[PDB]
Design a protein around this ligand. Structure first.
Ligand SMILES: [Zn+2]
Ligand SMILES: [Zn+2]
Ligand SMILES: [Zn+2]
Ligand SMILES: [Zn+2]
Ligand SMILES: [Zn+2]
Length: 188
C-alpha cells in the first residue's frame, strides 16, 4: 500500500513524500518505529498502524473500514462525516477513532485491532448535554479543557479541525493519556 515515507535520497531535495499529510486520528505528521502511516487507496486518509489497528502493512492495496464496506456513516459522538472511523460491537453504528480515544469512557477493546468500539453508553449524560463551543451543534458528546476550572466544551473532531492543542502522553505501562486544551489555553 501507499505509505508516507520520510528519508533523504541521494538525488537531494525534500526528506518527506507527503509533507502536508498528517495521521487522520492523532494528527501527527511522522511515522514511527513499527508504526507506518498508511494511505487508504479510496478516500486517501493516512493513519498510523497503531492508530487504526493495522497489524501488518499489506503489500497490495489498503482500504479503511468505511471504504472497504462502501459506507459513509456519521459518527455517534460528533457531527463530522468522513475520517478514520470504526464500527460498534454489532456493526450497526460508527465512531471516529479520535472521538473514541479522547472521550475517556469509550472502550477500544483490542489495542492491536483498535476495534470494536464499545461502552458508548458509559459516557455520562453531561458530555451529551454540553454544547460544543466550536460548532454549536446540540449533537454528540463533547470533552472539556484539561486546565483547572476551565469548562469550555468541544467535540473531539472540532477540536482537531480548529487547531486546538490535542496532547497525548505515553506512560511506562504503554497506556496513553489524552488531553485537550481550549484556544485560550493551547500552547501554540
Ligand atoms: Zn496517528
Ligand atoms: Zn478510506
Ligand atoms: Zn466523531
Ligand atoms: Zn463541534
Ligand atoms: Zn481552557
Amino acid at each position: 500500500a501507499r505509505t508516507k515515507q520520510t528519508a533523504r535520497k541521494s538525488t537531494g531535495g525534500s526528506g518527506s513524500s507527503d509533507e502536508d499529510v498528517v495521521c487522520d486520528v492523532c494528527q501527527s505528521p511522522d511515522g514511527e518505529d513499527g508504526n507506518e502511516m498508511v494511505f487508504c487507496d479510496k478516500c486517501n486518509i493516512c493513519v498510523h498502524q497503531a492508530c487504526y489497528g493495522i497489524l501488518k502493512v499489506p503489500e497490495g492495496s489498503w482500504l479503511c473500514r468505511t471504504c472497504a464496506l462502501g459506507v459513509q456513516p456519521k459518527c455517534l459522538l460528533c457531527p463530522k462525516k468522513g475520517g478514520a472511523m470504526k464500527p460498534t460491537r454489532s456493526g450497526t453504528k460508527w465512531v471516529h477513532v479520535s472521538c473514541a480515544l479522547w472521550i475517556p469512557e469509550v472502550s477500544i477493546g483490542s489495542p492491536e485491532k483498535m476495534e470494536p468500539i464499545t461502552k458508548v453508553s458509559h459516557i455520562p449524560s453531561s458530555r451529551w448535554a454540553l454544547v460544543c463551543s466550536l460548532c454549536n451543534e446540540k449533537f454528540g458528546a463533547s470533552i472539556q479543557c484539561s486546565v483547572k476550572n476551565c469548562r469550555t466544551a468541544f467535540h473531539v473532531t472540532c477540536a482537531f479541525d480548529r487547531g486546538l492543542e490535542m496532547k497525548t502522553i505515553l506512560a511506562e505501562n504503554d497506556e496513553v493519556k489524552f488531553k485537550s486544551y481550549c484556544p485560550k489555553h493551547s500552547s501554540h
